[PDB]
Amino acid sequence: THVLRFGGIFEYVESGPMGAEELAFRFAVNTINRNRTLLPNTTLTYDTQKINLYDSFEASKKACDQLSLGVAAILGPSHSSSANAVQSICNALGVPHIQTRWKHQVSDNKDSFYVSLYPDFSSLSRAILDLVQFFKWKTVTVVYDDSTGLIRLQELIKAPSRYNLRLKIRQLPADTKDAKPLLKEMKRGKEFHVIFDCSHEMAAGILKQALAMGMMTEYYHYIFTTLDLFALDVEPYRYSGVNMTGFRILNTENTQVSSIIEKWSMERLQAPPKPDSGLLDGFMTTDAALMYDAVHVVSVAVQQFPQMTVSSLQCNRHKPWRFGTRFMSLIKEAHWEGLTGRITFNKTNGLRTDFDLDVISLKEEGLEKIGT
């Protein structure tokens, strides 16, 4: 029972309601605790510090803190701003860093102690192109909300010079309701293949709009790049005869996957949901799944590195951790079945470029698989 701690960082409600990532992480540590098949001779505790959103200095101090007690590695906050702080901390003091949310890849950041289980945007976007190419649409239209969606689709944006197409680009304005006039001009625009890069919450806040202006008829077809396509409040709209298509690395075929899903669903509406928002209560989200998997890959590596030690280091003792060399390499080289399927780490840019994707579509009944 080798004791170990994992740094926990959560940009959260800063209030009573507890966030999903903390939940899945603790769910994860419990999962370790019950099944000893992984780590028969080892059990890992954890320290979970909590910070504010888009607030670097506070995160950095907390980073020094979870250094003070010592762990193997941190779990990155889910927003890039302080994420950069975290990363420039980790590789600065040698402790491997694991990230879940996509960050803006800085082209020349020579950091080396980081990976990201998130489906890297490039592969996703390439699949997007293959998909739209199959459906033989021409006047496609993107709508994002903030800046980084364009980046997520850059591979999409560069397509026209090789592929005969067109696409205007339209913006959801600052607040969600503001999208009604956008739908107005799109109605004027008559753009019948509009792909969306947007947070599924905003997807909900705009589907009410689209049905409200009656735009959802059988001609229109939308494809939603987001990965929590599962928990959409699908039921009323599927009888608008519309066509939707999307992806889900979130496997459901494994019965173990299911069983863990219902265990979650017991612990999940345990947290008070927002049914008024129009989200299907009782379904764990893609990010939380990712960060569940991440502890498991950490474990599936560490079990083979019992030489693990926890140097109680300080931010000002600039000499890095003693054992960040082989352990990080192990994570890079490890493979596992998480809750998304196959999992590995591309050794080229220290990221992930490999996974398995089921494309899913809105059938007459709801989300039903339409390929791999």
Next chain:
Amino acid sequence: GVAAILGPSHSSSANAVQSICNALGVPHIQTRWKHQVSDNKDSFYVSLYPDFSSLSRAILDLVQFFKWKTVTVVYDDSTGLIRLQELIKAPSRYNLRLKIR
């Protein structure tokens, strides 16, 4: 201590200093353009460098004055997208076909 600070050139590294000065009230000035995140509430930072937003408006004006009917945009790294988003939104308003490499 300083009366205030001048910013470093990058975007990413600049973020941290911006925040730090906000954590103590220092006025922070910058020199290069970066992408602001629309979800930062901070106040003590200003940019001399002209924003690329208005630049895009001017470029669009120039395009239309020449009356171009086709164009190519080329950038260095994807950040140029953010740098040009306003122009990138040309087609919705006027008859402009633009492509990117």
